[PDB]
Amino acid sequence: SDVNDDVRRAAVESLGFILFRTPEQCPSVVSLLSESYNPHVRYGAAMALGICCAGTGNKEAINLLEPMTNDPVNYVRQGALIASALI
Amino acid sequence: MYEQLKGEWNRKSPNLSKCGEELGRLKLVLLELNFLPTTGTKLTKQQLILARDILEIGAQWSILRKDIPSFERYMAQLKCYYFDYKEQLPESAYMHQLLGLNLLFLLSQNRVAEFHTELERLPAKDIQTNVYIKHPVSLEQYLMEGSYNKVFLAKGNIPAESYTFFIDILLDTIRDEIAGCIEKAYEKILFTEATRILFFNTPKKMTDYAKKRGWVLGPNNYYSFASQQQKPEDTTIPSTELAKQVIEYARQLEMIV
Amino acid sequence: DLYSRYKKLQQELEFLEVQEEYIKDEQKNLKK
Amino acid sequence: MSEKKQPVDEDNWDDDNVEDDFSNQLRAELEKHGYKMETS
Amino acid sequence: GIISLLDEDEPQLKEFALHKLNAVVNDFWAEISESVDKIEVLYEDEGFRSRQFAALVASKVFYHLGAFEESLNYALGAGDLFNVNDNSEYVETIIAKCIDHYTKQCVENADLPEGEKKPIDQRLEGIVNKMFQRCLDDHKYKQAIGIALETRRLDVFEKTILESNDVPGMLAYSLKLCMSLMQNKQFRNKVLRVLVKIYMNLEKPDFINVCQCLIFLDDPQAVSDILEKLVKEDNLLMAYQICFDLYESASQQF
Amino acid sequence: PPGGGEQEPPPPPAPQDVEMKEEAATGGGSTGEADGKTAAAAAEHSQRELDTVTLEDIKEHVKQLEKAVSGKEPRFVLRALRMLPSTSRRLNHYVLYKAVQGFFTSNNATRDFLLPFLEEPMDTEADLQFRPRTGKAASTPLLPEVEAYLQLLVVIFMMNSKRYKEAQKISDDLMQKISTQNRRALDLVAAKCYYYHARVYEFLDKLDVVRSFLHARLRTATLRHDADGQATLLNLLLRNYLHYSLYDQAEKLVSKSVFPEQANNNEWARYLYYTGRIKAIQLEYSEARRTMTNALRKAPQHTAVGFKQTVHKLLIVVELLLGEIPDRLQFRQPSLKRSLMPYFLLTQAVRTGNLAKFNQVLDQFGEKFQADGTYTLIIRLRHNVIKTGVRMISLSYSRISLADIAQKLQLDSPEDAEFIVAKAIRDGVIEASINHEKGYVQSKEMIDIYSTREPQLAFHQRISFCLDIHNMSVKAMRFP
Amino acid sequence: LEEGKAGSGLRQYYLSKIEELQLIVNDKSQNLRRLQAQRNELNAKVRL
């Protein structure tokens, strides 16, 4: 509902801070939010997928971040590299 | 056990201690055995020969003593006793009269839906023979044709006794419907129209209707009040429900994607 | 196991309902 | 596709509507229809 | 034919009518619609000694219709002739609604600990513990601990974890269920502080269980009350272990 | 043997093979669907079910010697199927018993060995895991056993196969019900044996223990979820009681259970037929015919099967009691030829003002009227014939007198003509009024309906119904 | 019976209760995936 990109990032980056205990829910919501129309909703979903799952071989978060790093926009390629290194 | 089989029934029944005797006689039969499984074993059919008969004479007593909740009790208890799974139960000569007493009773209480749905149990006793069922079904036919005369001309023709409390209610359920049909936008008619709509040459009935309802005889002319409606509608007044209908459209058009 | 599953079916039911609201919520707002 | 309930189960082209309307109303249409003038 | 018998004022007749009613209720289902109204209007007669079966067949019809609260109000009001039944498809569902009704009352009353509590019938808890006595008869206390967590009650929690318990290791199993699946933080210290009751008077005190709970709780002095005892008992090989576990787990300000 | 024996080798081998493969890949397909993704609503369960009703009832009716259907019981006698080596050993057996019965003969059925073919395949280390495999292999002998129609120590083998199937049915529904739910096939499988359980009793006696058990299954169902079990179980309780020419109409009236909510477009068609019969016999005609229509117009994808013959035969009867009657013989059938003539002769004499031809046709065709299954036409038609005349006159004449309508209706009594119209106005035949002064009978006055709040109320019916058509059709399709 | 008198009073409270918690999730999975794909259609429109 909000329109500034900064709060739209910070809301969808907060997914990992609230659901890190259950990793079976973070790829459920990121996989749709990481395919929005703007990059910002796609970007903060990429940081949330990285900070939710700490060090577990997931193979789904890897599968979701692969088109995320395959993007024309430079910073959404960046955080996908950040999230891939974090997982 | 074997208590008062045929007492005061073949001649008269003015007394009332036979009621509590038959009541205690009904206490004995239910405390003998239940009628619920009823598989075979003619020994327990013998006690069902008597148990049906004591309700039959109990029903003959209730129709003799002018009792409305009793007659429907004994008949439904008899109807449960004809309702048997393994009913061999040899031929009772009063069942044709008993069903005729039920069928005219149900027609008297204005149950035309219950009238027809009862008429499924008799295969070929309606047309071939058995006036005791043929007389109510000819009577229902005469209500559907439109011949009120043929109803009361046939009132003085009874096969079994007189069916007096049945034709009294049958008089009762006709004349109010006739009175309910006439209390309309009519204003006044002479005695001769109430001699054609109704019947007999100056009975106490016109006095009965004069004390209860109106129809007051004045100078050889009755007076019926108008029972029509006079509601001055405007109908743009229920404009709120119309705007309610317009809004709930666009509610249902939107709001779910 | 009969008690352990029953809260888990609640948690999967509750996690589903916040989602299916939100995707109805987003798709309403995505039309603008 | 049978549904387990079966107890038991030319001359014109389509002329039911006229025959449901008029079945036997002296279709020669001459003898009263043309001959009222002798009666009046 | 029972309907006019229910109309006639005779107590030996009415007993025989409801004796025929509760036996045939498997077959006549909505035929007795008007009569169970006449039974229920004539239920307020306290001097009439057929009221238990009166509340029985009033319960039998409304569950068939679907009126579950009125089935449940007359299941409690029936009494012991209700309470004898345990082997049926009918009885198992209304007690399921009763445990449903009982725990949603206790969930409701756990939000107002300062009085204003709803009244509690004794017959509804009279089948709570009777079922819980059937829970102990199972030799399966995971079944018994489940209702005990749902009902929001603490002494039944303490009694299940120490009764027979083959093998006695359910103190960790209850601690995992409290830690993993939980939403409320209100009674979460209550479940924690009733675990430290059984941990402290356990036959093998005290080191690992209470200290890990009091890391999770906020007791700065109760840890020092027992760590002094760990030093006083001349035990420094595992006191060395429990203090590193306190250092690694617990954060600042503790 | 020169003519008929040479065409004995071609019929077994390939229909033995191709019918066996289709039910194998479905039963293997049902098992994987039972194991993972139990959401099998648009899966192959119903279409395999639509095969067994149609093809296996018209492909074969006998037990199929040269071990074709008779070889299914000595094939499936040694089946255990528990562990992954145990399944691979049984899959080795599935190949071997087909290869032997395909090459040579193994074990033959002589219409008497029905107890060894049903107890030992039920036994021999069989488990309660592969539940539709067990329920199908007990339901498939029930068809040729009835279709043989020999009745020589056969009813008891029907009966024990039913009771074992019911014992396997209760063992499913009570113990280990964790994501199997075979009710989608078990309802019809219960319905098929109950058709046979009715018919076998109908060869000899009545049936009431079948219905007391059917209450009991209805008692043990209907609390979980309504998943088209309760719908068919309601009809099987309803069909016999209407077939009994005594009573049980009031039992259906108080039957507050009308919520099956889905029917696979199969049950609701015939469910709306039976409740139309009951609203017709309870003298509620307007709601009767509109759902009698709704039953007939639903599924016409039927090549002269008979219920379509029977709803069409009754719908024209309830239309005659109302008064209007359209064409009915416009879709002529080779089965309709023995049914189109009496009712068309019936509606001819009704709509005309004749009586003696009507009674002659009634005297001639009463044997069919009893064989069809309605008796109330004898009382409900004599109201129609006397009111067909007054409705046509009141529709025609704007203002007719009583002395004219008495002579027009061959009545010979100018006194009850006020009484007939008073019955006509009361019963709702026509809205008129009698001026009881000299015999003026007027009629309607105004014809304006347009700006008088008529059209909007029908329009509010059209909007709210079709948006409900819309949103249901929205949700029914976005499954992926 | 140490078990037969226990499967209808205390286990049957659990088995008859989990089934509704299973079938709603089984139903609302269709209703979720309905909203999923409908969101994927409109997002494919706006991005293009």
From Swiss-Prot, chain C:
It comes from the Eukaryota. It is found in: Cytoplasm; Nucleus. Belongs to the AAA ATPase family. Component of the 19S proteasome regulatory particle complex. The 26S proteasome consists of a 20S core particle (CP) and two 19S regulatory subunits (RP). The regulatory particle is made of a lid composed of 9 subunits, a base containing 6 ATPases including PSMC4 and few additional components. Interacts with NR1I3. Interacts with PAAF1. Interacts with TRIM5. Interacts with ZFAND1. Component of the 26S proteasome, a multiprotein complex involved in the ATP-dependent degradation of ubiquitinated proteins. This complex plays a key role in the maintenance of protein homeostasis by removing misfolded or damaged proteins, which could impair cellular functions, and by removing proteins whose functions are no longer required. Therefore, the proteasome participates in numerous cellular processes, including cell cycle progression, apoptosis, or DNA damage repair. This is 26S proteasome regulatory subunit 6B. It comes from Homo sapiens. The lineage of its organism: Eukaryota, Metazoa, Chordata, Craniata, Vertebrata.
Swiss-Prot record, chain D:
The keyword Zinc-finger does not apply. Its main location: nucleus. GO terms for cellular component: cytosol; integrator complex; nucleoplasm; proteasome complex; proteasome regulatory particle, lid subcomplex; protein-containing complex. One of its GO terms (biological process) is double-strand break repair via homologous recombination. It comes from the Eukaryota. Keywords: Nucleus, Proteasome. It is found in: Nucleus. Component of the 26S proteasome, a multiprotein complex involved in the ATP-dependent degradation of ubiquitinated proteins. This complex plays a key role in the maintenance of protein homeostasis by removing misfolded or damaged proteins, which could impair cellular functions, and by removing proteins whose functions are no longer required. Therefore, the proteasome participates in numerous cellular processes, including cell cycle progression, apoptosis, or DNA damage repair. This is 26S proteasome complex subunit SEM1. It comes from Homo sapiens. The lineage of its organism: Eukaryota, Metazoa, Chordata, Craniata, Vertebrata. The gene is SEM1.
Swiss-Prot record, chain E:
Component of the 19S proteasome regulatory particle complex. The 26S proteasome consists of a 20S core particle (CP) and two 19S regulatory subunits (RP). The regulatory particle is made of a lid composed of 9 subunits, a base containing 6 ATPases and few additional components including PSMD1. Interacts with ADRM1. Interacts with ZFAND1. Component of the 26S proteasome, a multiprotein complex involved in the ATP-dependent degradation of ubiquitinated proteins. This complex plays a key role in the maintenance of protein homeostasis by removing misfolded or damaged proteins, which could impair cellular functions, and by removing proteins whose functions are no longer required. Therefore, the proteasome participates in numerous cellular processes, including cell cycle progression, apoptosis, or DNA damage repair. The chain holds residues 7 to 260 of 953 of the full protein. Belongs to the proteasome subunit S1 family. This is 26S proteasome non-ATPase regulatory subunit 1. It comes from Homo sapiens (Human).
From Swiss-Prot, chain G:
It comes from the Eukaryota. This is 26S proteasome regulatory subunit 8. It is found in: Cytoplasm; Nucleus. Component of the 26S proteasome, a multiprotein complex involved in the ATP-dependent degradation of ubiquitinated proteins. This complex plays a key role in the maintenance of protein homeostasis by removing misfolded or damaged proteins, which could impair cellular functions, and by removing proteins whose functions are no longer required. Therefore, the proteasome participates in numerous cellular processes, including cell cycle progression, apoptosis, or DNA damage repair. The chain holds residues 11 to 58 of 406 of the full protein. Belongs to the AAA ATPase family. It comes from Homo sapiens (Human). Component of the 19S proteasome regulatory particle complex. The 26S proteasome consists of a 20S core particle (CP) and two 19S regulatory subunits (RP). The regulatory particle is made of a lid composed of 9 subunits, a base containing 6 ATPases including PSMC5 and few additional components. Component of a complex with USP49 and RUVBL1. Interacts with PRPF19. Interacts with TRIM5. Interacts with NDC80. Interacts with PAAF1. Interacts, in vitro, with the thyroid hormone receptor (in a thyroid hormone T3-dependent manner) and with retinoid X receptor (RXR). Interacts with ERCC6.
